[PDB]
Write a protein that binds this DNA or RNA. Structure first.
Length: 69
RNA sequence: UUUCUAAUUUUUAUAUAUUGAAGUAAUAUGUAUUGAAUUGAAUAUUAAAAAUACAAAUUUAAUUUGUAAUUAAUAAAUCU
């Protein structure tokens, strides 16, 4: 999606990992809110995992096991 | 229809518009869950969960963008 706009996202991933590689239990899928301005300069907030991710952990169920009745 | 006359029924009757409301804004459970190659309100089914209002769409292979934001607009007042 950067390359749709010509941005070598090989950098952002590093700027991401400049903030997310430590601090974190392994395999914690975070949400990134990338926001691209008319100058193409992005600004991104990292956010705790989606609560649906939390919920399946706290009950120990994989994808497809849970459902509305 | 005796004849002159008089008379109250007439190839004259009323027809649906004012307004291509189109500016006013970044986000935040959430890309719910399931079924799914994929689906993020806009595949399929499923629809009474919430909170700090905007899930019956367009759009995209998916999203984001981008259109859209429940409003003044009184023909009725017979025309004879």
């Amino acid at each position: 999606e950067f390359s749709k706009l010509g941005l070598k996202a090989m950098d952002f991933a590093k700027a991401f990992n400049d903030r997310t590689k430590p601090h974190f239990k392994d395999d914690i899928e975070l949400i990134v809110r990338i926001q691209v301005y008319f100058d193409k300069s992005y600004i991104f907030r990292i956010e705790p995992p989606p609560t649906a991710w939390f919920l399946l952990r706290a009950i120990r169920k994989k994808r497809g096991e849970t459902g509305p009745v």
